[PDB]
Write an enzyme that holds these catalytic residues in place. Sequence first.
Site, PDB file in Angstrom:
ATOM      1  N   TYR A 509      45.578  49.932  40.821  1.00  0.00           N
ATOM      2  CA  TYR A 509      45.756  49.264  39.524  1.00  0.00           C
ATOM      3  C   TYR A 509      46.654  50.147  38.653  1.00  0.00           C
ATOM      4  CZ  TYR A 509      45.112  46.498  35.330  1.00  0.00           C
ATOM      5  OH  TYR A 509      45.343  45.725  34.209  1.00  0.00           O
ATOM      6  N   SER A 592      48.318  42.305  39.342  1.00  0.00           N
ATOM      7  CA  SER A 592      48.535  42.401  37.905  1.00  0.00           C
ATOM      8  C   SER A 592      49.305  43.704  37.601  1.00  0.00           C
ATOM      9  CB  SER A 592      47.191  42.272  37.159  1.00  0.00           C
ATOM     10  OG  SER A 592      47.413  42.145  35.768  1.00  0.00           O
ATOM     11  N   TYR A 593      48.794  44.593  36.734  1.00  0.00           N
ATOM     12  CA  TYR A 593      49.438  45.903  36.566  1.00  0.00           C
ATOM     13  C   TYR A 593      49.555  46.586  37.938  1.00  0.00           C
ATOM     14  CZ  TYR A 593      51.129  50.033  33.990  1.00  0.00           C
ATOM     15  OH  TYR A 593      51.915  51.051  33.484  1.00  0.00           O
ATOM     16  N   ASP A 670      50.432  30.681  35.920  1.00  0.00           N
ATOM     17  CA  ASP A 670      50.030  31.931  35.289  1.00  0.00           C
ATOM     18  C   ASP A 670      50.574  32.012  33.846  1.00  0.00           C
ATOM     19  OD1 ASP A 670      49.484  34.662  34.645  1.00  0.00           O
ATOM     20  OD2 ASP A 670      49.709  35.216  36.750  1.00  0.00           O
ATOM     21  N   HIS A 702      46.462  33.600  36.477  1.00  0.00           N
ATOM     22  CA  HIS A 702      46.460  35.022  36.759  1.00  0.00           C
ATOM     23  C   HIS A 702      45.311  35.493  37.655  1.00  0.00           C
ATOM     24  CE1 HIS A 702      48.354  38.828  36.303  1.00  0.00           C
ATOM     25  NE2 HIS A 702      47.290  39.407  35.777  1.00  0.00           N
TER      26      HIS A 702
HETATM   27  N1  LIG Z   1      46.420  41.607  29.119  1.00  0.00           N
HETATM   28  C1  LIG Z   1      45.674  42.845  29.330  1.00  0.00           C
HETATM   29  C2  LIG Z   1      44.410  42.782  28.464  1.00  0.00           C
HETATM   30  N2  LIG Z   1      43.480  43.869  28.821  1.00  0.00           N
HETATM   31  C3  LIG Z   1      43.529  44.583  29.969  1.00  0.00           C
HETATM   32  N3  LIG Z   1      42.540  45.505  29.977  1.00  0.00           N
HETATM   33  C4  LIG Z   1      41.830  45.388  28.834  1.00  0.00           C
HETATM   34  C5  LIG Z   1      40.719  46.036  28.296  1.00  0.00           C
HETATM   35  N4  LIG Z   1      40.263  45.669  27.077  1.00  0.00           N
HETATM   36  C6  LIG Z   1      40.808  44.670  26.356  1.00  0.00           C
HETATM   37  C7  LIG Z   1      41.928  43.960  26.822  1.00  0.00           C
HETATM   38  C8  LIG Z   1      42.457  44.304  28.069  1.00  0.00           C
HETATM   39  C9  LIG Z   1      44.570  44.373  31.067  1.00  0.00           C
HETATM   40  C10 LIG Z   1      45.303  43.034  30.814  1.00  0.00           C
HETATM   41  C11 LIG Z   1      46.542  42.862  31.635  1.00  0.00           C
HETATM   42  C12 LIG Z   1      47.485  43.882  31.689  1.00  0.00           C
HETATM   43  C13 LIG Z   1      48.653  43.719  32.426  1.00  0.00           C
HETATM   44  F1  LIG Z   1      49.567  44.701  32.476  1.00  0.00           F
HETATM   45  C14 LIG Z   1      48.897  42.548  33.107  1.00  0.00           C
HETATM   46  F2  LIG Z   1      50.036  42.458  33.812  1.00  0.00           F
HETATM   47  C15 LIG Z   1      47.971  41.507  33.068  1.00  0.00           C
HETATM   48  C16 LIG Z   1      46.791  41.668  32.320  1.00  0.00           C
HETATM   49  F3  LIG Z   1      45.903  40.667  32.278  1.00  0.00           F
END
Ligand SMILES: N[C@H]1Cn2c(nc3cnccc32)C[C@@H]1c1cc(F)c(F)cc1F
EC number: 3.4.14.5
Lengths: 728, 728
Positions: A509, A592-593, A670, A702
Amino acid sequence: TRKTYTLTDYLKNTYRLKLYSLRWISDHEYLYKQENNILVFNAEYGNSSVFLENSTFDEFGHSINDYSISPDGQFILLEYNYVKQWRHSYTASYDIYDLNKRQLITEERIPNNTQWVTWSPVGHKLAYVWNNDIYVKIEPNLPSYRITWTGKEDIIYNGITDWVYEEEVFSAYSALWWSPNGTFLAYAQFNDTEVPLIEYSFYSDESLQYPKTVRVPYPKAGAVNPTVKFFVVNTDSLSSVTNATSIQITAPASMLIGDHYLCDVTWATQERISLQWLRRIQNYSVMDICDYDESSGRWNCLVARQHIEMSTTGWVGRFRPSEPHFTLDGNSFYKIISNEEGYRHICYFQIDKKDCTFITKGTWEVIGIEALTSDYLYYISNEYKGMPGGRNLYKIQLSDYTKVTCLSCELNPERCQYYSVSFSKEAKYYQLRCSGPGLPLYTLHSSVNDKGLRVLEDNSALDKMLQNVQMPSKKLDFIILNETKFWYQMILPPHFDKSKKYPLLLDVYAGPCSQKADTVFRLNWATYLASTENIIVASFDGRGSGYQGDKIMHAINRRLGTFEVEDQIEAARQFSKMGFVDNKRIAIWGWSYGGYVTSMVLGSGSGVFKCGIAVAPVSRWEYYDSVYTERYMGLPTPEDNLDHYRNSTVMSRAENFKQVEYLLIHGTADDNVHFQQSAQISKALVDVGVDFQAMWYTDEDHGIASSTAHQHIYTHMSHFIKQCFSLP
Amino acid sequence: TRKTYTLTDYLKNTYRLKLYSLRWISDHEYLYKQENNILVFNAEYGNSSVFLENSTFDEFGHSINDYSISPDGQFILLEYNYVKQWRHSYTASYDIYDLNKRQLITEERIPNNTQWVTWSPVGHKLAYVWNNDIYVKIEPNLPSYRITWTGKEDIIYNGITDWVYEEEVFSAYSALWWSPNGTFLAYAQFNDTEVPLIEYSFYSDESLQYPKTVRVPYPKAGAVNPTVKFFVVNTDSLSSVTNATSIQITAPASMLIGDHYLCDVTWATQERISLQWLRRIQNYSVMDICDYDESSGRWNCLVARQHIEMSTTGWVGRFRPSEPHFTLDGNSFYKIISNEEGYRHICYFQIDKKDCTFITKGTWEVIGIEALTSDYLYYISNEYKGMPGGRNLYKIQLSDYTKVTCLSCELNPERCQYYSVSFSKEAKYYQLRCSGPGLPLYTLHSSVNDKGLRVLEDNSALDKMLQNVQMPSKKLDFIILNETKFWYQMILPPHFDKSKKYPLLLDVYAGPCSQKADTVFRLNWATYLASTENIIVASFDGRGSGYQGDKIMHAINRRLGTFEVEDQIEAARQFSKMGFVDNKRIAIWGWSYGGYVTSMVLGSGSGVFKCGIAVAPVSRWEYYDSVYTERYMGLPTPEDNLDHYRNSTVMSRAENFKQVEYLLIHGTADDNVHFQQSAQISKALVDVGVDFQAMWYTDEDHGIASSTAHQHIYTHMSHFIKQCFSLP
Ligand SMILES: N[C@H]1Cn2c(nc3cnccc32)C[C@@H]1c1cc(F)c(F)cc1F
Ligand SMILES: *[C@@H]1O[C@H](CO)[C@@H](O[C@@H]2O[C@H](CO)[C@@H](O)[C@H](O)[C@H]2NC(C)=O)[C@H](O)[C@H]1NC(C)=O
Ligand SMILES: *[C@@H]1O[C@H](CO)[C@@H](O[C@@H]2O[C@H](CO)[C@@H](O)[C@H](O)[C@H]2NC(C)=O)[C@H](O)[C@H]1NC(C)=O
Ligand SMILES: *[C@@H]1O[C@H](CO)[C@@H](O[C@@H]2O[C@H](CO)[C@@H](O)[C@H](O)[C@H]2NC(C)=O)[C@H](O)[C@H]1NC(C)=O
Ligand SMILES: *[C@@H]1O[C@H](CO)[C@@H](O[C@@H]2O[C@H](CO)[C@@H](O)[C@H](O)[C@H]2NC(C)=O)[C@H](O)[C@H]1NC(C)=O
Ligand SMILES: *[C@@H]1O[C@H](CO)[C@@H](O[C@@H]2O[C@H](CO)[C@@H](O)[C@H](O)[C@H]2NC(C)=O)[C@H](O)[C@H]1NC(C)=O
Ligand SMILES: *[C@@H]1O[C@H](CO)[C@@H](O[C@@H]2O[C@H](CO)[C@@H](O)[C@H](O)[C@H]2NC(C)=O)[C@H](O)[C@H]1NC(C)=O
Ligand SMILES: *[C@@H]1O[C@H](CO)[C@@H](O[C@@H]2O[C@H](CO)[C@@H](O)[C@H](O)[C@H]2NC(C)=O)[C@H](O)[C@H]1NC(C)=O
Ligand SMILES: *[C@@H]1O[C@H](CO)[C@@H](O[C@H]2O[C@H](CO)[C@@H](O)[C@H](O)[C@H]2NC(C)=O)[C@H](O)[C@H]1NC(C)=O
Ligand SMILES: *[C@@H]1O[C@H](CO)[C@@H](O[C@H]2O[C@H](CO)[C@@H](O)[C@H](O)[C@H]2NC(C)=O)[C@H](O)[C@H]1NC(C)=O
Ligand SMILES: N[C@H]1Cn2c(nc3cnccc32)C[C@@H]1c1cc(F)c(F)cc1F
Ligand SMILES: *[C@@H]1O[C@H](CO)[C@@H](O)[C@H](O)[C@H]1NC(C)=O
Ligand SMILES: *[C@@H]1O[C@H](CO)[C@@H](O)[C@H](O)[C@H]1NC(C)=O
Ligand SMILES: *[C@@H]1O[C@H](CO)[C@@H](O)[C@H](O)[C@H]1NC(C)=O
Ligand SMILES: *[C@H]1O[C@H](CO)[C@@H](O)[C@H](O)[C@H]1NC(C)=O
Ligand code: NA
């Protein structure tokens, strides 16, 4: 010879973890669903009664998705016609059932297509959002009072979040907050007028002749953001005035100078609310503490009560500034903040003094504040045994900070190293939830003497089943790089033999504040890969990872796609050095990431990895949303960080993919990481003449989480990994 | 030992076919571009002169896409800034160069983004369409006269076709028709007001932050169609002071009763125009013959001069009712129509008599009428040796129909069995173009005694090169099904050994009136597969195929996805029983209609095929355009043909894919067969848990024809086929 844990085992859920999901309705009673009945349990003694018989709604005519009992226990809200929207948002229909009259309410019903509904915290008032406006019902059978008239689809959101606030700021669809006894209703209003739309096709059932174009206000990095206003209305005045006034609380001048966000709302007392605001450049935050002025009917925020929180090394907070926890009188609060050494610890504030006092310290971090009583603060941390991937509950004496008791550390140290907790309404009881390294264990405890009352669920059924299975093992350890410990885990095949060379899959990740090396028990794709296919599945927490201090977490500040990528490559080099890894069979995968990092690694020219799979990857930071992206990257302008935005794309590494086998996968619907991101990867690869494997998932988002698509993707990836590793 | 024809040879065009593309400018002379210089040739003697030097536009400043010399030779139209739209449509900028005064015209230039431009057929008038409106220039340096004022993007089309008329009716963007001496300009006007739009994403270059949504008016089967009107304007009486008066010619009453199309426009004389109209139920067509009335300025179409053309077994025409070929006085005409035996032959009509007389007959068909004089009509047919996949030029003596002379059959029977022809202005000379089975051969002839004057291009260069390559051969033959012969071809590996077992790839199209078994020489992907990979590449023409009479062609009337699918399976079954075919290694592939058939074959449950590849397939007829689909299928309504629309889908066969390897490929910017169609296939297969291989091509259309995507697709498909056949 015992069977192994197979792909079908994972996909069909043949080995199921039992949970114990309870709902505290008071200081000593909780609700539990058993056999579709709702039972009410007495925490002290463990005896129960039927709260609501399973058959009560047989002739309801609809399948009930969920329920919500009013705080006074007089009414139950029944949710049905559930239709999912984004990660947290959905719409539904609602009926209210009168528990004392044992009757469904048929007048002045909550409308269909309601976006959010919440009971008041005391009594049985309701607030709901419908067609983007807020309504309040004082009594379940009586007419609603309309609170806002400006709601407009995709444009003005009252009491609910837009796409980016839902995903990145509040992690919730709801944007309203009842005061503690329900007198006041606070809410945010989002204006998305000039926010650009993402547009993509939705194909639907095959009966649909023309595809639908889905259009969502979504600010990509550097684009026009939604604007926000904050209001408070006195619900007690609703039956006395034709149109009760929503009183605006304006952001401080230090926020109004430019683009900003509302990032936290927390009531302190019946007449005191705290709000946190964040600059679009997310290293400066301001908390205002505002009091109701009875003579003027206004809300005033004294500058003497305003608290600044900034970062010189990174952004503020792990993913957002932390929430305050107020003492009963609302004159002081506790907040997790990064100390002088970069470790997140609990600080105690007086509301009108700017300097706080740290009540915890050390080279470990507080994860969350869980409960606060007049005498004790309860919190979760990774202090125990210096393991950043473990979690335990601790109790600190407010009159004596030297008195800190670990409540969970020694309960079952072998089986249980990762806890979360659920306290009753006034913290008289707590449920501990152990999630590993052994089978999850759910227990109940009295706060008065911290004694264990009973085991709620011990997963003995599953333990019995798993005895007949060749299960893999899990190693959690660290390697030292540049005098710093970096943690890794390995899922190891059954009968692991250190004298043999195994294929290795790096499961990635690696986003900011991520943690992939921990003590949690999982039954997942990795279990099958290790158990059946004899593949080591490894994960590594390098620079940018969380819960280990800011020196590590802020290492990727303004530089996504650098150190966290390199550290995954270096991790694989280190795993080879260990002697039980076949260097000719190292793969990498992520979602994802993790898909972004996988792609960056495969495009790096390292020669370390034979093959890899990216699922729904980010490919270019300018394509991802403003709030998340800018937090780490700042703005894509020549004056800020455009050069790095342009230097950190997957597409610029296309030529290097000639050295690897790549599988690229994305759902076409997505809303989060747009299909665009993989469409641009594939086009760049085509353009340099690189062969690769591809799979789109029609109408999947997603999560690629529909039952059939989930089974299909893991089936597809399994064939790909096995082919790469020459496994029959 | 010599090389084979490799995948790189196909992809990099190592072995190039030479052409001889000439442009007749009179009865005695033609234009030919050589070394970027335009030359004029005398047909009788073959002497030439330089018409226009390459270096004339050295300082022009733009890359010139194409040129068009005015009929009188006085001007040259220079096409640049070419931007493709659909199959035939594009926009461009234009300049006109005066050939006598050797200068670019700088006054009153044709605007940028012009959609269509054409010289008058005599002299040097121009008509052009810009922003959906028609303009006329009497002299290249003089101001244009605006003809129409109603043009509106995506709504009103004057003198140009909308998406469906371009693709399906006229095979042209132009909807302008000059009278023979340029006096009158006829044009159609299309109204797409209520036609629904297909919407799809276009990703563009990586720099584009948000994808663009392309929106095209496109009527899917059963949807609201464009409407049409037809006008004629006198270009000799245009005025700078007054707006031009266009005279409407309305469709006959038998068309106005419901939905209809304009399907042909053919000028007969200076003052007589013919139009054919087609009912939306495309088995009824009417030709009107309309005469200019000099006293009223109106165009009258006498009912005595109406000609009805209908079909009781299918639709009218091969893809539309055929064009008439009028005599000099325009009092009679020749037209190909289906005779009482269902074979297409030339019928002779008097303009005011109902019955026509067939002048050809037999169990073969006339392909096209090519030239007409007072003494002879010249046509192409597949009569020779009863081979439906061969083509030869014939002339018929109009005073004695028993006197038919084949003009190409015997020129070179071994090398040349497939001809097309280009006649000079009054048919004094003709160019023959032989395209197989040997290397293409271009020759020039004079009509008076059919002398073979000279060889223009014999491809002797390519022949020398190919001598050093192990080239495949082609077998053309037939099988009998139910007392009927159906033709097939096989591309056979070099040194073909009938005692060896070869894998076989079935290359399918099989659309209505298709022909995939012929005598044409091709250098394509199949050449490589046979030459290098030793795979037999077979194609078969079954029920629904063309050029063999309506018994065969109309067999699939109202029933697409039935007999043409069954017949491919039957052919493969028969091939699989031949001594030289490995029945364990039979594959199928197709593009477009062929991708639909490939998919229906693979979902048939036949067990004959190991694997197949569908490129841009139709999957459900309700997703394809009205004009094509309804021609064969009628309307998707309960009262018409809905039941067959619903059970001829690929999706319903999803379960049957479990025993085959399938590769599904589609361009995301396919305006023709929408990506939707493959998106619904993938979802159906996911829904039944069938694994398959996929590839999308970002921003590619129906052709997947960009240089990089073309190389990528054929590379990816080659890997897939080789894998399937266990080939190294
Ligand atoms: N949009 C982000 C929201 N998020 C993420 N971790 C969290 C922890 N706490 C609140 C919001 C949080 C990863 C999430 C996220 C990060 C990404 F880089 C991505 F490509 C796709 C994703 F869904
Ligand atoms: C659990 O048992 C307790 C105690 O037995 C119940 O509480 C009361 O019990 C006393 C007699 O022991 C009586 O006054 C009533 O029958 C009970 N009153 C209540 C609270 O209903 C209690 O009901 C039980 N709890 C549940 C949820 O079943
Ligand atoms: C949401 O924000 C928009 C600005 O984007 C506001 O729209 C403007 O309203 C003013 C009137 O106050 C008009 O003069 C402008 O023409 C509008 N601008 C645009 C870009 O539309 C809108 O009023 C806001 N809505 C709410 C309820 O706050
Ligand atoms: C209740 O009061 C609000 C706030 O005054 C009213 O909202 C205003 O309505 C007028 C006219 O409809 C607009 O010109 C203002 O821009 C609105 N302002 C806000 C804050 O929304 C609302 O209309 C009132 N409702 C009733 C029933 O009178
Ligand atoms: C909940 O808290 C609110 C706010 O403190 C209470 O409302 C106030 O009640 C006091 C009486 O003690 C009065 O002085 C004020 O007029 C009220 N203020 C407002 C803003 O309405 C309310 O009574 C409390 N509700 C309950 C059920 O205790
Ligand atoms: C076609 O487009 C070009 C470029 O827009 C026009 O060229 C003119 O000269 C320069 C650029 O080459 C521009 O600054 C002018 O605006 C252009 N127009 C003028 C006013 O001369 C060209 O004129 C266009 N052709 C036609 C016939 O409209
Ligand atoms: C092309 O044909 C048109 C139509 O027949 C000719 O126009 C006519 O010419 C005669 C004079 O010779 C006039 O009496 C008529 O009034 C004209 N008719 C119309 C409809 O205008 C035209 O002269 C011919 N032009 C060429 C280039 O030969
Ligand atoms: C043109 O085709 C249509 C459709 O096949 C024919 O019209 C009728 O179609 C309906 C069902 O759509 C049937 O109930 C009738 O049997 C059809 N007509 C007949 C044969 O009686 C129509 O007849 C065809 N027109 C021509 C000129 O043959
Ligand atoms: C081909 O040859 C003929 C001569 O055989 C060329 O000559 C004719 O036309 C010329 C100019 O147009 C004149 O110079 C000649 O006098 C004329 N000859 C006769 C009597 O016909 C002809 O132009 C040549 N064609 C080309 C295209 O070059
Ligand atoms: C193009 O076709 C439309 C019909 O689809 C014509 O518009 C007509 O239909 C309207 C509804 O869309 C009616 O309100 C009108 O009676 C009628 N005309 C008007 C005023 O729009 C339209 O006129 C056609 N356009 C042209 C130039 O022929
Ligand atoms: N749209 C059609 C137009 N067309 C076709 N053959 C023709 C012959 N003459 C005129 C138009 C012709 C096939 C072509 C076509 C048919 C299809 F079924 C398809 F899926 C995709 C296509 F492009
Ligand atoms: C919800 O929708 C259904 C179907 O349209 C309708 O019968 C019902 O009355 C609706 N409920 C409310 C509260 O409007
Ligand atoms: C916030 O970040 C920007 C960019 O790094 C920097 O210039 C600015 O000084 C930072 N502000 C604070 C409060 O550190
Ligand atoms: C021609 O017609 C157009 C559109 O109706 C009009 O705007 C214009 O004024 C007309 N010109 C003349 C000369 O009448
Ligand atoms: C009611 O719940 C289920 C039916 O859904 C049934 O099995 C169960 O026995 C019932 N509850 C009781 C009284 O145990
Ligand atoms: Na000759």
